[PDB]
Design a protein around this ligand. Structure first.
Ligand SMILES: CCC(CC)(c1ccc(OC[C@H](O)C(C)(C)C)c(C)c1)c1ccc(O[C@@H](CO)CCO)c(C)c1
Lengths: 9, 238
């Protein structure tokens, strides 16, 4: 969740 | 060192400087250390670790090649390495004067008792101190330190990595930058078998990771303890 959202791009 | 290898080092050094504040200013914001549940240091160390995870993420994002991996692989690498990079990066505050982490305050000087008061036993803590001491004794230059953290994160053998071939290619480029740096810059006798000693530290980290995980699994299963952990810690160590 938090990790995926931070790494998104 | 090639132009590319020099650029890798410059990028990693900047990334570290941008994600490691040697003034420890942000620490006032953490829940307070309590030293007087017997797990009195759990809230403070949970906050310190949660902060540290955010910094490791920020650092990893800048490693050349990391953002060319899939989202899934980036997540696998970070979840598996986070505790290890935290242990590595903490070496910078670690002091052999009293085997403690000195973070700029009398009450932010962390010792073995502190880690035990977050629920851990000497089965983890003693090898952890031995690791910090051995690492300190390598007398790494900042370039070597940041390369080692980067190599730790980009490990192709982590459980669940999809494109292990690409992760290995990135790791080998970093490893060769490190070996070249040691050859070009690190003086004898400190340079002797240095790369091997550093690779051994990575193996030592796998063992510390396994023990930390076991202990964390046990302590976090208690709802009174879990309730004191941050969402980020819960996700990353979960
Ligand atoms: C790595 C050493 C230590 C020592 C206090 C630590 C903290 C919490 C721990 O366990 C936490 C528990 O597992 C839970 C999650 C249950 C609370 C364990 C095993 C070790 C630590 C961690 C981060 C940190 O900040 C450093 C590194 O980021 C920056 C300043 O050097 C410093 C200075 C020390």
């Amino acid at each position: 969740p938090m990790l995926m959202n931070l790494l998104k791009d | 060192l090639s132009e590319e290898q020099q650029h890798i080092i410059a990028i990693l050094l900047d990334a570290h400087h941008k994600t490691y504040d040697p003034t420890y200013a942000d620490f006032r914001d953490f829940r307070p250390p309590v030293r007087m549940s017997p797990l009195s240091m759990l809230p403070h160390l949970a906050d310190l670790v949660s902060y540290s995870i955010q910094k490791v993420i920020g650092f990893a994002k800048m490693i050349p090649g990391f953002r060319d991996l899939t989202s899934d692989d980036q997540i696998v690498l970070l979840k598996s390495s986070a505790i290890e990079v935290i242990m590595l990066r903490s070496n910078q505050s670690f002091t052999m004067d009293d085997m403690s982490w000195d973070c700029g305050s009398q009450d932010y000087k962390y010792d073995v008792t502190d880690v035990s008061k977050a629920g851990h036993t000497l089965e983890l803590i003693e090898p952890l101190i031995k690791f910090q001491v051995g690492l300190k004794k390598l007398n790494l230059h900042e370039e070597e330190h940041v390369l080692l953290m980067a190599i730790c994160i980009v490990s192709p053998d982590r459980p669940g990595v999809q494109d292990a071939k690409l992760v290995e290619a990135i790791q080998d480029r970093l490893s060769n930058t490190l070996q070249t740096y040691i050859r070009c810059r690190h003086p004898p006798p400190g340079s002797h078998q240095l790369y091997a000693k550093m690779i051994q530290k990575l193996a030592d980290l796998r063992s510390l990771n396994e023990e930390h995980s076991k202990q964390y699994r046990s302590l976090s299963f208690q709802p009174e303890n879990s309730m004191k952990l941050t969402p980020l810690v819960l996700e990353v160590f979960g």
